[PDB]
Amino acid sequence: MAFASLIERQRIRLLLALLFGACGTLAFSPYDVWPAAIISLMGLQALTFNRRPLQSAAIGFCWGFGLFGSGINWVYVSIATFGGMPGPVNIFLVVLLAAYLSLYTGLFAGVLSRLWPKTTWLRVAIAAPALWQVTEFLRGWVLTGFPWLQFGYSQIDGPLKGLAPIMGVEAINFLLMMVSGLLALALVKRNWRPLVVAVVLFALPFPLRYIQWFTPQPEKTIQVSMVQGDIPQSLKWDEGQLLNTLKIYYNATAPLMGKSSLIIWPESAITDLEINQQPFLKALDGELRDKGSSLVTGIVDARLNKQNRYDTYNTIITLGKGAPYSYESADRYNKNHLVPFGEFVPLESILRPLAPFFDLPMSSFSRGPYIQPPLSANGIELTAAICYEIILGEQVRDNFRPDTDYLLTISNDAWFGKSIGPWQHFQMARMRALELARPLLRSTNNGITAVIGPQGEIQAMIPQFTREVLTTNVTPTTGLTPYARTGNWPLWVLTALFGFAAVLMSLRQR
Numbered sequence: 001m002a003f004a005s006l007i008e009r010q011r012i013r014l015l016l017a018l019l020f021g022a023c024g025t026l027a028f029s030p031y032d033v034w035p036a037a038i039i040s041l042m043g044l045q046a047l048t049f050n051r052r053p054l055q056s057a058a059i060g061f062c063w064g065f066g067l068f069g070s071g072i073n074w075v076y077v078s079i080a081t082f083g084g085m086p087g088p089v090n091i092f093l094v095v096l097l098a099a100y101l102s103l104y105t106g107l108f109a110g111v112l113s114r115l116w117p118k119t120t121w122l123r124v125a126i127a128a129p130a131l132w133q134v135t136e137f138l139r140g141w142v143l144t145g146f147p148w149l150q151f152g153y154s155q156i157d158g159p160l161k162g163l164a165p166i167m168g169v170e171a172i173n174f175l176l177m178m179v180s181g182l183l184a185l186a187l188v189k190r191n192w193r194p195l196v197v198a199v200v201l202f203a204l205p206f207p208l209r210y211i212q213w214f215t216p217q218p219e220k221t222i223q224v225s226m227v228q229g230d231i232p233q234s235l236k237w238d239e240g241q242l243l244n245t246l247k248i249y250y251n252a253t254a255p256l257m258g259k260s261s262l263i264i265w266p267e268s269a270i271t272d273l274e275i276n277q278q279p280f281l282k283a284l285d286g287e288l289r290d291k292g293s294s295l296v297t298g299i300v301d302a303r304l305n306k307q308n309r310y311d312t313y314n315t316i317i318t319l320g321k322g323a324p325y326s327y328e329s330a331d332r333y334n335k336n337h338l339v340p341f342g343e344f345v346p347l348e349s350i351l352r353p354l355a356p357f358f359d360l361p362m363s364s365f366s367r368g369p370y371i372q373p374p375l376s377a378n379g380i381e382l383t384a385a386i387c388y389e390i391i392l393g394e395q396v397r398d399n400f401r402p403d404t405d406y407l408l409t410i411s412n413d414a415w416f417g418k419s420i421g422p423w424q425h426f427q428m429a430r431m432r433a434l435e436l437a438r439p440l441l442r443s444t445n446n447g448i449t450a451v452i453g454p455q456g457e458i459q460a461m462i463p464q465f466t467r468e469v470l471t472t473n474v475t476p477t478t479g480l481t482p483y484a485r486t487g488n489w490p491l492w493v494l495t496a497l498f499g500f501a502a503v504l505m506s507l508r509q510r
């Protein structure tokens with residue numbers, strides 16, 4: 001009914017911004033509709049056409065609220081099981097988190113329409129990808145960051161997956177924003193010329209998916225076993241369950257010894273402190289060496305500092321053949337990027353008492369080094385990353401080394417819930433394997449335990465929410481991708497070149 005005048009209304013565009021924003025959630029792992037990434041990003045740039053900077057900022061905020069209000073709505077489950085706050089309060093925090101993350105999308109659309117008001121190819125293909133890179137960086141950097149729901153991860157199986165090993169996932173974000181803008185420009189203004197450019201730019205990286213930046217090593221093939229303990233989150237941290245948790249993991253591991261060269265346990269599989277479990281770990285370490293097996297397990301360690309102080313770390317320790325266990329051994333990985341409000345108090349302003357008050361046990365962890373040596377287990381180099389750290393592509397690459405055999409991640413996705421949460425985390429983990437051309441060994445308490453191939457494919461996987469062991473043969477790969485050699489700087493040079501060119505034209509055109 002008179003769409004020409006109906007679309008001009010600001011309220012109509014705000015309502016459509018929610019719909020197009022929420023459409024981007026369909027691009028990620030539980031749904032895997034990668035065209036929805038383009039459709040969602042076409043609504044972010046078509047609806048902001050011919051708007052005042054404040055009007056465009058509101059449209060960008062509503063688009064972000066639609067994406068984050070439906071994409072990370074699973075945070076309610078994590079908030080529900082943390083602190084035990086009332087239901088209305090938990091709903092408020094999820095809305096507050098979605099509103100906060102939507103500021104960057106609102107900031108992007110406000111600045112984009114402020115400096116490039118005209119609906120031209122410069123705005124959508126040059127200014128938008130460069131400004132999207134900056135605002136997405138800020139979202140993942142400000143206040144410890146939260147770079148969730150980046151559309152580049154939707155192309156893990158799409159035509160643009162070949163661009164990830166060369167320039168990273170953030171380059172797929174750069175190209176998706178460029179292609180979507182040209183399609184939006186070709187649609188709002190009836191003109192096939194930006195349509196052809198978008199299709200050509202989208203089809204150019206397709207042959208890149210057939211390039212193998214790695215070499216398989218069949219001579220070093222091993223049998224890896226990952227024990228999905230499936231320990232309930234409510235009972236995970238209890239004195240009585242400590243014996244049961246150790247018994248469950250040990251009983252599932254004894255048959256694996258000898259048959260499996262590498263055995264992996266999830267994040268914080270041993271819920272007790274590392275110093276409190278020395279007789280158990282020493283006996284376990286000795287038994288593993290007899291049968292020639294190595295165990296890589298997560299554990300909480302409260303290491304006494306020099307100044308008579310305890311620094312609690314979320315650590316991964318290694319036992320068995322190729323890695324003798326000792327409390328002073330450097331063959332360990334301490335988690336560096338702690339989860340905000342779950343492992344530390346942000347900025348520790350006054351630490352005023354509140355309803356949560358760190359209700360969940362072990363909520364005062366410390367930070368490990370940003371760059372740590374790879375774990376060694378039975379002559380195997382593993383680049384470790386605990387849970388959330390696997391989505392930090394640049395941090396994983398910095399810890400990545402040319403002699404790394406596998407990428408290793410252990411997580412406890414019970415906080416993500418029983419919904420799209422664990423899958424979105426799993427999809428971002430698969431990107432690390434694609435970018436670095438290394439097999440990914442992902443072990444979770446009850447989440448998505450899987451082995452990811454060097455090209456991002458799911459080599460093996462087991463169902464969630466069950467007590468099962470994933471035993472499979474995995475082959476290490478060697479060779480450096482262009483992303484592994486360089487990192488994100490070649491994209492930041494491109495962002496600077498596109499940003500500098502676009503800003504110059506903005507200044508030239510008044």
Ligand SMILES: CCCCCCCC/C=C\CCCCCCCC(=O)O[C@@H](CO)COP(=O)(O)OCCN
Nearest residue numbers: 078093096097100268339341342361362363412415
């Ligand atoms: C203004 C900016 C912000 C706006 C408002 C934000 C509102 C909500 C924000 C944050 C709340 C989310 C907190 C979720 C906690 C998840 C962390 C966690 O418990 O992680 C576990 C997952 O693995 C660690 O493993 P575990 O062994 O199970 O440990 C048990 C814990 N000692």
